Design a protein around this ligand. Structure first.
Ligand SMILES: CCCCCCCCCCCCCCCCCC(=O)OC[C@H](COP(=O)([O-])OCC(O)COP(=O)([O-])OC[C@@H](COC(=O)CCCCCCCCCCCCCCCCC)OC(=O)CCCCCCCCCCCCCCCCC)OC(=O)CCCCCCCCCCCCCCCCC
Ligand SMILES: CCCCCCCCCCCCCCCC(=O)OC[C@H](COP(=O)(O)O)OC(=O)CCCCCCCCCCCCCCC
Ligand SMILES: CCCCCCCCCCCCO[C@@H]1O[C@H](CO)[C@@H](O[C@H]2O[C@H](CO)[C@@H](O)[C@H](O)[C@H]2O)[C@H](O)[C@H]1O
Ligand SMILES: COCCOCCOCCOc1ccc(C(C)(C)CC(C)(C)C)cc1
Lengths: 68, 54
């Protein structure tokens, strides 16, 4: 279906690929290495519960007053 | 949604419901216009009756 050149990636000679840099002494920085810096929110979860309650309540209050 | 009581949006809003303020303005204008006439008529009647009898 396809010639061997397309599969192996070269017609005659296999060219050397420059390897990937590492940046010794620190973590890799890639699109997939970002969870090292940004975990899921874990610090303000209970504050999230409180603020969700208060937001619901205040919205309901002002909406009911407006409607009435 | 919980406070409105409606899942889509507020109620009693819209030009069908907002126009009633202007309708009240016009109705109050008409009402005062007629009440001034009625009060003038009644005042003339009373001013005649009292000064004729009293
Ligand atoms: C339920 C649907 C998912 C159930 C299982 C999936 C799951 O819960 O994963 C956690 C999932 C996401 O994880 P998470 O990081 O903990 O999310 C933060 C919470 O949403 C932050 O909110 P919360 O759950 O920590 O507390 C908010 C609180 C607020 O209480 C209120 O005032 C609401 C009153 C409602 C009446 O509501 C309640 O906890 C219970 C009252 C009923 C809601 O949380 C939920 O979806 C459950 C709460 C969602 C409620 C509204 C859903 C629309
Ligand atoms: C908007 C920013 C995306 C927040 C993704 C959170 C994260 O650090 O990213 C972590 C998540 C994966 O979470 P998990 O490791 O728990 O599977 O996604 C990624 O790994 C890369 C997301 C790339 C898109 C960036 C936008
Ligand atoms: C099957 C019925 C008949 C139809 C046959 C043809 C079907 C073609 C559709 C499939 C195409 C697949 O296409 C595929 O693309 C990749 C790209 O990642 C090529 O990949 C090639 O190039 C990359 C770089 O670009 C080289 O590093 C690699 O060594 C080399 O394989 C594959 O050689 C090719 O096979
Ligand atoms: C809208 O999205 C914003 C995109 O921009 C992201 C901004 O990123 C800058 C982050 O700045 C830093 C720099 C260093 C660090 C350190 C190295 C201090 C974090 C550490 C110690 C956890 C590895 C953290 C954040």
């Amino acid at each position: 279906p396809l010639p061997n050149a397309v599969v192996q990636g070269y017609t005659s000679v296999r060219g050397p690929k420059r390897p990937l840099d590492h940046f010794y002494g620190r973590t890799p920085l890639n699109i997939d290495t970002l969870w090292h810096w940004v975990k899921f929110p874990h610090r303000y979860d209970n504050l999230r519960f409180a603020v969700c309650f208060w937001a619901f309540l205040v919205s309901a209050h002002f909406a009911n007053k407006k409607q009435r | 949604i919980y406070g409105r009581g409606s899942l889509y949006g507020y109620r009693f809003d819209g030009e069908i419901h907002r126009q009633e303020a202007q309708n009240v303005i016009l109705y109050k204008e008409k009402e005062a216009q007629e009440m001034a006439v009625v009060m003038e008529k009644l005042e003339k009647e009373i001013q005649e009756w009292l000064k004729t009898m009293e």
